[PDB]
């Protein structure tokens, strides 16, 4: 859901990094060498801009961000048994799997319901 123009420019910076670090004597084409740099810049941009707040910061969270999309097959929450199976392969704890599962399905509402109320505004209680 990110703009296409922003993704293209992120890859362009990664392409320049590979060009600056290219050894012609290896004999491989620059296309195969630069594919790792370009996709690394795009991945970092998606993590920081997919939501209003960064979803994955630690090492374990980043691994689960790109794997839970494919591992998840049926809508809803994982049962207890499915947590260990996911955690065993990726080398993460059961706490991380459940925490990232909640972060994936969260939908952010727009500001316009008990969230518009200022919780430190009741002056009558303070006077009493």
């Amino acid at each position: 859901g990110l703009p296409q123009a922003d993704l293209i420019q992120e890859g362009n910076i990664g392409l320049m990094k590979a060009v600056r670090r290219f050894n012609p004597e290896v004999g491989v084409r620059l296309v195969s060498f630069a594919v790792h740099w370009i996709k690394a810049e795009i991945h970092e941009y998606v993590l920081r801009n997919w939501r209003i707040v960064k979803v994955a910061t630690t090492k374990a969270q980043r691994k689960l961000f790109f794997n839970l999309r494919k591992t998840k097959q049926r809508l809803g929450w994982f049962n207890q048994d499915e947590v260990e199976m996911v955690a065993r392969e990726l080398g993460v704890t059961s706490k991380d799997v459940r925490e990232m599962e909640s972060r994936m399905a969260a939908q952010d509402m727009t500001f316009d319901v008990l969230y518009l109320q200022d919780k430190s505004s009741n002056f009558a209680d303070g006077i009493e």
């Binding site: 922003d6 910076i13 969260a106 727009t110 969230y115």
Partner: protein, 916 residues
């Protein structure tokens, strides 16, 4: 805090930098794990302020004693958390960007200043073509649009001498290079030279703009942004929710996009990138800035998750949901309530029924104060507990609090000022508000589910204003035309009409009575009926132009009911007022005469007594409605038969080619209209009268006592047009396109319609319902426009030295005198003399307020033309004078200074807009 005016001007980069408390450098908002602000982000506490009262971010200082310390670790000042609503930031732009308001808002200011087409400026700004900034070898001149191929041709031949750029930097250089005074001189010269008028108009617009820039002091290059201010964080909230969700404003997303693209542009510029990628990044930065300032103005609006466009800064302050109309011209208020309204038939005109629970909730601080004063409670908490438990002393305290404390009642929509009135509360049980029946017409309220709002004035001045201006007893005349606004209707009118009717052979006819008290005594004991014709000794008083009342006793020919009703009439009115069958118009004339002769308080008392008597005798009458009260005339079948025979004759005449189809259709319509008129006349003739035997044993005729006829004739409710549908014929129905159907509905609601007739009739009902549902918005829009245009006119002077005016004459159209002179000159002030030797006219000196007596004097003689002063011809600057306006229609005397007549005029014009 005592400002005198508000000033607006352009903002320089230095001013924007002076506003800010720091620079936002990172596109981060908060940490997901701990809801703490990120450093140098859009919510940074170092820039905008602490998140908690008298605390720093890390937590070293946590007390008020450290009022001004800046923490060495976190760098956060230790102050109040409310400063986050006032502190702004700024963003340093890597490349200049144009302000979309000064570009796309027609007429374009940048284009007019540069004398360049808007399309060329748009092409240059969004990196599609070049523009010449300085001359080369004279092949290219300043402000010439070079295409990429033309730029390639020019660069190789002319060398580096000429300069051409792309984006906002070139336009900024062009704006900075200009000198305004020489341009003004040249424009003035060639304007004096030119002969074409369109060129003159264009150049006078350009000169206006240039002189505006010269006089204002703003610099032309300030329309290109180099520093971008940032809204304080508390005006764009970001609050966490339970299930890992957040609620956020779109401004955060727009700011993050702008910051991201600016940082990427800086990184590319520091990386020695090729020109095309930097050009693309600059274009995207310009697009992001344009979207932030005003989203939906140039192209596709940037959308969010719900496919809806993001709300920008400009959307916050414009529209029906913007700051102005939603929060500044109208607000939600404390000390208010709302409940369903019911009718109270016992209340006096100045009283309303308020539920006990509503009053208890509304008057809480007053009860707390009076509880503390009496010593029954020492703290606020103890009074709160006592009120919550609802002890008996709280009710007495509330009864003391509400005494002589008026409240305001309001019903939406408020079309005129009579929609808000003050009443003295009376505490009742239940949860419904009780309303006096006589103010329903002013409120346009009926007891079928309507709700009304309650407001409590707080200060002494507000209470005095309510009592002196907004009390119901002070508002009895309409401010639009001066007619009384409290008119009895429905049950009261029917009761009085039934009270004041007469019968030929009623029980007790022929007696002679000593007075109204004897008549009441006779009626209550069942000896005589209300409709008996008798003779009564009646005493009536009259003012004799000296201030005193002179009695005059005599014997009158009247009825028992009229004599009984005479006991409530105040002293000073003739007996002829009540010596007739009283309808709605008669009651209105009674009230108007009472107001004219005696005043205001007697009028209020008389109205209350009239309402009580009308209700009582309407209840005693026992009027009802039955299926037999709708008498169908016996000649209906015969008339319909003749109409059908004539229609068949016309049809046969058409079948032989003698008459065309359209003439046949018109003749059928005419025949059916005549038949309907005949049926209606027969119905009304049958329903109008009845037979009765008198004292001599011979038959007589008199007005009927039919319930439907009585209701229609008294004017309480109904009209002949509805009786025609009830017992005569429905008539001719129109097609949805507006054409008249050949066959009318020959049945009525008593007989019952068939399927086809009802289906035909549904069309007009739906059309009328749709028109009623749709005209209100147009009426409201017109009222808003009138109020806005007329809001600032106030009477400011007692008298102006003008002598002019306008000529007032009666208006006649088609030979019918539509409006007489008295109703057009009543309350005005004469511009010139009226004595007029030669016409034998009345001696009326100049500057005379035309009173009712002067109107009568002008009426008796033959006068057809008078000059009166008008507000259009007033000679007062910034307002009008009292004499040119005339009479305050709501009060009756001359208008006082400081009255907002524009709002009153707009409301008076707009209120009946829903009746068209």
């Amino acid at each position: 805090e005592e400002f005198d005016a508000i000033k607006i001007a352009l903002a320089s980069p230095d001013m924007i930098r002076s506003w800010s408390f720091g620079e936002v450098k990172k596109p981060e908002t908060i940490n997901y794990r701990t809801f703490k602000p990120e450093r140098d982000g859009l919510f940074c506490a170092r820039i905008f302020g602490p998140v908690k009262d008298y605390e720093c971010l890390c937590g070293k200082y946590k007390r008020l004693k450290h009022r001004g310390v800046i923490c060495e670790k976190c760098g956060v000042e230790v102050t109040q958390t409310k400063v986050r609503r006032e502190r702004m930031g700024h963003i340093e732009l890597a490349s200049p960007t144009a302000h979309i308001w000064f570009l796309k808002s027609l007429p374009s200011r940048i284009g007019l200043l540069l004398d360049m087409p808007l399309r060329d400026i748009e092409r240059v700004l969004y990196f599609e073509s070049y523009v010449v900034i300085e001359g080369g070898m004279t092949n290219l001149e300043r402000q010439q649009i070079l295409t990429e191929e033309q730029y390639l041709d020019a660069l190789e031949e002319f060398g580096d001498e000429f300069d051409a750029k792309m984006g906002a930097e070139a336009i900024q250089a062009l704006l900075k290079s200009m000198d305004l005074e020489q341009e003004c001189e040249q424009l003035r010269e060639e304007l004096n030279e030119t002969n074409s008028e369109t060129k003159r108009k264009k150049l006078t617009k350009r000169i206006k703009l240039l002189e505006a820039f010269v006089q204002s002091g703003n610099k032309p290059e300030w329309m290109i942004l180099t520093v971008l201010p940032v809204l304080p964080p508390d005006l764009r909230p970001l609050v966490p929710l339970d299930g890992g969700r957040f609620a956020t404003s779109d401004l955060n997303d727009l700011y993050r996009r702008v910051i991201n693209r600016n940082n990427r542009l800086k990184r590319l510029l520091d990386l020695a990138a090729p020109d095309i990628i930097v050009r693309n990044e600059k274009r995207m930065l310009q697009e992001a800035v344009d979207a932030l300032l005003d989203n939906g103005r140039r192209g596709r609006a940037i959308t969010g998750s719900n496919k809806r466009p993001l709300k920008s800064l400009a959307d916050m302050i414009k529209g029906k949901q913007g700051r102005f109309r939603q929060n500044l011209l109208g607000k939600r208020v404390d000390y208010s309530g709302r409940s369903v309204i019911t009718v109270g038939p016992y209340l006096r005109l100045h009283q309303c029924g308020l539920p006990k629970k509503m009053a208890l909730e509304l008057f809480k601080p007053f009860i707390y104060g009076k509880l503390e004063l009496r010593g029954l409670a020492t703290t606020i908490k103890a009074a709160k507990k006592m009120v919550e438990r609802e002890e008996a002393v709280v009710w007495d305290i509330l009864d003391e609090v509400i005494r002589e404390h008026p409240v305001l009642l309001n019903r939406a929509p408020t079309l005129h000022r009579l929609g808000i009135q003050a009443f003295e509360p009376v505490l009742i049980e239940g949860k419904a508000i009780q309303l006096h029946p006589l103010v329903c017409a002013a409120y346009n309220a009926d007891f079928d589910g309507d709700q009304m709002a309650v407001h409590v004035p707080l200060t002494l001045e507000a209470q005095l204003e309510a009592r002196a201006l907004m009390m119901s007893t002070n508002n009895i005349l309409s401010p639009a035309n001066g007619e009384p606004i409290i008119v009895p209707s429905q049950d009261v009118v029917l009761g009085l009409y039934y009270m004041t009717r007469d019968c030929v052979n009623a029980k007790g006819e022929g007696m002679v009575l000593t007075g109204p008290k004897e008549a009441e005594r006779l009626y209550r004991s069942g000896l005589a009926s209300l409709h008996a014709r008798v003779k009564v000794r009646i005493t009536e008083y009259e003012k004799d132009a000296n201030g005193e009342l002179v009695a005059k006793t005599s014997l009158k020919d009247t009825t028992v009911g009229r004599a009984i009703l005479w006991m409530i009439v105040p002293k000073g009115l003739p007996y002829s007022i009540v010596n007739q069958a009283l309808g709605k118009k008669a009651i209105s004339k009674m009230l108007n005469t009472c107001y004219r002769i005696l005043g205001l308080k007697p009028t209020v008392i008389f109205a209350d007594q009239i309402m009580y008597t009308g209700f009582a005798y309407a209840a005693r009458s026992g009027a009802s409605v039955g299926i037999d009260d709708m008498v169908i005339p016996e000649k209906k079948h015969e008339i319909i038969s003749e109409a059908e025979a004539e229609v068949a004759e016309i049809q046969e005449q058409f079948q032989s080619g003698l008459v065309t189809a359209g003439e046949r259709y018109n003749k059928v319509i005419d025949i059916w209209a005549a038949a309907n008129d005949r049926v209606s006349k027969a119905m009304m003739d049958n329903l109008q009268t009845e037979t009765v035997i008198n004292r001599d044993g011979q038959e007589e005729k008199q007005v009927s006592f039919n319930s439907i006829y009585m209701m229609a004739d008294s004017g309480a409710r109904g009209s002949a047009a509805q009786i025609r549908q009830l017992a005569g014929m429905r008539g001719l129905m129109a097609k949805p396109d507006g054409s008249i159907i050949e066959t009318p509905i020959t049945a009525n609601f008593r007989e019952g319609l068939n399927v086809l007739q009802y289906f035909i009739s549904t069309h007009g009902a739906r059309k009328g319902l749709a028109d009623t549902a749709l005209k209100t918005a147009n009426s409201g829009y017109l009222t808003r426009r009138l109020v806005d245009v007329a809001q600032d006119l106030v009477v400011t002077e007692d008298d102006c030295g003008t002598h002019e005016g306008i000529m007032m004459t009666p208006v006649i159209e088609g030979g019918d005198v539509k409006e007489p002179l008295r109703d057009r000159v009543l309350g005005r002030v004469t511009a010139e003399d009226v004595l007029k030797p030669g016409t034998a006219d009345i001696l009326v000196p100049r500057n005379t307020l035309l009173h009712e007596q002067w109107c009568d004097l002008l009426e008796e003689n033959s006068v057809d033309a008078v000059k009166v002063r008008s507000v259009v011809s007033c000679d007062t600057d910034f307002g009008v004078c009292a004499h040119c306006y005339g009479r305050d229609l709501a009060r009756g005397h001359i208008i006082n200074k400081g009255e907002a007549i524009g709002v009153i005029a707009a409301q008076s014009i707009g209120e009946p807009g829903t009746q068209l």
